Design a protein around this ligand. Structure first.
Ligand code: NI
Length: 230
């Protein structure tokens, strides 16, 4: 069962499913995109040719998939998981309908090297693992991508370098917030219907905390969007 394999994959702790972390990360992404200035949100709308609401759901879903590379026997019970994320997303985002070049660029944005694409050796090593993994893993990773897109209500756009870099920076921030168990406690069950609502509440509380005077001291401006500088 691919669904069982997908749900069994872990992130960061045995009681924290990968899917839970992916949805947490998406929730952070969506919550912070809602708080960004109108100029920032308008850029996303223009990046993807979507009404603002759809553009933001799409970006949030993409950012949630930053750890899809962990859905591999290599990271469950050397090459960084982001290299796998890039290889997997290159294929999977094309299967979802994104044109080749946009898919390749986004995959690198969500990969191991803060938007710079994995080199030949890294991709050789990774493919070496992929050749010997149980085939069900390939199916489990398609399942997970579809699960996140469906939970976020993300549409496919009908890609400029700045659009891709905006997603890169967002994923880096959101992954960091969601990765903190003091903000996003382990043990929440992502099968539950109410999971995303609860993750959005946690996202809102976390972003509030991160902004307090003893944490945030200035702002980071990257590619037309803004993050607290911690
Ligand atoms: Ni992560």
């Amino acid at each position: 069962s691919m669904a069982a394999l997908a749900l069994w994959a872990k992130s960061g702790n045995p009681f924290h499913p990968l899917l839970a972390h992916m949805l947490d990360t998406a929730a952070v992404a969506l919550a912070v995109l809602r708080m960004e200035p109108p100029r920032t949100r308008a850029l996303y709308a223009e990046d993807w040719g979507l009404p603002e609401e759809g553009a933001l759901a799409w970006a949030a879903a993409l950012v949630g998939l930053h750890d899809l590379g962990k859905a591999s026997p290599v990271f469950q019970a050397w090459v960084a998981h982001g290299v796998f994320t890039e290889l997997f997303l290159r294929r999977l985002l094309k299967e979802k309908g994104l044109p080749e070049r946009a898919a390749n660029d986004l995959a690198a944005a969500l990969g191991a090297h803060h938007g710079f694409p994995a080199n030949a050796e890294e991709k050789s090593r990774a493919r070496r693992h992929l050749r010997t993994e149980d085939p069900l893993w390939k199916e489990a990773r398609r399942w997970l991508l579809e699960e996140v897109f469906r939970r976020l209500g993300a549409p496919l756009p009908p890609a400029r370098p700045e659009a891709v870099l905006r997603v890169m920076a967002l994923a880096s921030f959101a992954d960091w917030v969601a990765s903190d168990p003091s903000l996003f406690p382990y043990g929440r069950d992502p099968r539950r219907g109410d999971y995303l609502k609860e993750a959005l509440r946690l996202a809102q509380e976390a972003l509030n905390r991160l902004g307090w005077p003893a944490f945030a001291k200035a702002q980071r401006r990257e590619f037309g969007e803004l993050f607290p500088y911690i």
